């Protein structure tokens, strides 16, 4: 094998892991710190909640008798009622959203480049599986060897593997669905599509057969204590 | 001596099958419960090996006994039902683990060949009495549980002290024949069995 310098472990292997871990934490914390809710007026939240109610009605009107459901239908999408008809109305925001979307991967690539410069010329670890030779130019950046096994990796690709393998850990410790990783606007069209969808929907009162399906079995009663 | 291996297997496993079919397995379908008990027993064995490495014979035996008792208590708390039946679901799982442990693998590697040592049939006998030993252990666990009264803590402490009786008898036999030693272990295990059933008839109230 190869008698690698022990100091390469104490100053090039572990620091990379620590950097990746804390950079992920930093990135997640900066993401949550930067996020500020945009102010919403009454109309937008009102229409969003109205279409929410309409959709949940479409979803589960089955537990509601037919007349209540078709009265709901009349109220929402029907000329006479009026509802769903008389219900309608470098930029800073684009730059901000583009920067926010960019800051999820670009900092990682910049850190990788900085590491590649800072830690150029080493052999950090041997990958325990026989990688292909064609992957040599990128795994062994900063190494002048020619016949070296492809399983030996430079600092940059080791950092890349580290950053690839730590997202699950981030979700494990930081919390579920953390932001440290690598990866309605229009109501008129929404109104019309809700109109069409709830027009297409039908009714099936799920209570039409609850009694018969209840009479079959006795009521659970144990554990009353 | 494959047919001897057959005879020894008939001696060891079949009483377990008999207990399985005579203890109302269909009451809970204890295959899953037995599997959980066996996993716990394997874990306890792993813990005992680790503890022995960490930490002459009495200390190791005490650690193994403590781990087994703790595992049995945890397994018992894992399930709810008939007291005799939790007794069964614990004891049967642990006993199956013991047979499946290093008292079946030597029976496979040894035996079935040309040699004939009484050790295999003796091991089968001892495994069969291990059934009642684990019955005793489960009785002790149930006594620890099932409320507290009538000098119950004194009896529980005495029963806990009586655990690791196998190591004590082994030490005595080492200081002191193989068939004689096996017989002595059988009689002491039977004495503990009768003590535990006496406790059971005392506690039924």
């Amino acid at each position: 094998e190869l008698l690698l310098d022990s100091n390469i472990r104490l100053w090039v292997v572990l620091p990379i892991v620590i950097i990746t871990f804390f950079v992920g934490m930093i990135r997640h914390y900066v993401s949550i710190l930067l996020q500020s809710d945009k102010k919403l007026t009454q109309e937008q939240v009102s229409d969003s909640q109205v279409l929410i109610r309409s959709r949940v009605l479409r979803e589960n009107g089955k537990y509601i008798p037919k007349q209540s459901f078709l009265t709901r239908k009349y109220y929402f999408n029907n000329p006479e009622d009026g509802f769903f008809k008389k219900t309608k109305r470098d930029p800073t925001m684009l730059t901000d959203m583009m920067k926010g979307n960019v800051t999820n991967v670009l900092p990682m690539i910049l850190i990788g480049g900085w590491i590649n410069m800072t830690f150029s010329g080493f052999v950090t670890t041997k990958v325990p599986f026989p990688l292909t030779l064609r992957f040599k130019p990128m795994l062994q950046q900063g190494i002048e060897l020619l016949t070296l096994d492809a399983s030996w990796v430079s600092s940059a690709s080791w950092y890349f593997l580290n950053v690839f393998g730590l997202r699950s850990i981030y979700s494990l410790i930081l919390g579920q669905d953390n932001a440290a990783d690598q990866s309605p606007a229009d109501t008129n069209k929404a109104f019309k599509t809700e109109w069409e969808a709830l027009e297409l929907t039908d009714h099936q009162w799920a209570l039409d057969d609850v009694e018969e399906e209840l009479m079959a079995k006795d009521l659970h009663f144990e554990g009353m204590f | 001596t494959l047919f001897h291996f057959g005879n020894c297997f008939a001696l060891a496993y079949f009483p377990y099958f008999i207990t399985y079919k005579c203890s109302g397995l269909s009451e809970y379908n204890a295959f899953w419960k037995c599997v959980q008990a066996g996993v716990t027993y394997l874990f306890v064995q792993l813990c005992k090996m680790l503890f022995l490495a960490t930490f002459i014979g009495e200390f190791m035996k005490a650690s193994v006994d403590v781990a087994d008792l703790i595992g049995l208590n945890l397994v018992m708390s894992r399930n709810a039902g008939k007291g005799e039946y939790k007794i069964m679901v614990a004891a049967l799982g642990w006993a199956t683990a013991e047979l499946i442990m290093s008292r079946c693998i030597p029976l496979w590697v040894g035996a079935r060949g040309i040699e004939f040592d009484w050790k295999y049939i003796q091991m089968s006998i001892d495994s069969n009495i291990s059934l009642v030993h684990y019955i005793v252990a489960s009785a002790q666990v149930w006594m620890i549980t099932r409320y507290d009264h009538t000098f119950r803590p004194a009896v529980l402490l005495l029963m806990f002290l009586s655990v690791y009786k196998a190591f004590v008898m082994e030490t005595f036999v080492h200081l002191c024949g193989s068939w004689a030693a096996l017989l002595a272990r059988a009689v002491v295990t039977g004495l503990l069995a009768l003590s535990t059933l006496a406790l059971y008839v005392a506690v039924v109230n």
Binding site: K39, L40, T41, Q42, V45, S46 | -
Partner: protein, 140 residues
């Protein structure tokens, strides 16, 4: 009986909207008197309930303490503003509470707490019809 146990009990008693003002106010007082520093900011929401229970319990003495602590901690906060409104309503002080809620609404129009508290004031005043009308309008 450790502060974690009563803390969990208060958390549960908050999770489900109970109204045993006596028990919850006693437990909150014990936590904020004995184990105030035993845990961090998690008592702060308690400092809300503790006063509300107080307003339900009538023991207004610690309501001022909780309110002053929250206000000194959270200046210009809509939550503390609604809480002051409830404090005012505890003594049927309705005009000042209504003015405060109106100020909250003009400061933030999407707030729903002010509307709920003001209709609560209206229904406490006995104007059931106008309360129904106000709820219908607010739901709109």
């Amino acid at each position: 009986v450790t502060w974690e146990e009563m803390r969990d009990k208060m958390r549960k008693w908050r999770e489900e909207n109970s109204r045993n003002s006596e028990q919850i106010v006693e437990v909150g007082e014990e936590l904020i008197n004995e184990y105030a520093s035993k845990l961090g900011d998690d008592i702060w929401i308690i400092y809300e309930q503790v006063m509300i229970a107080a307003l339900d319990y009538g023991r207004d003495d610690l309501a001022l303490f909780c309110l002053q602590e929250l206000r000194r901690q959270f200046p210009g906060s809509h939550r503390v503003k609604r809480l002051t409104g409830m404090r005012f309503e505890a003594m049927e002080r309705y005009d000042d509470a209504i003015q405060l809620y109106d100020r909250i609404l003009q400061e933030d129009p999407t707030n729903t707490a002010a509307r709920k508290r003001k209709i609560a004031i209206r229904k406490a005043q006995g104007k059931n019809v106008e309360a129904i009308r106000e709820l219908n309008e607010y739901l709109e």
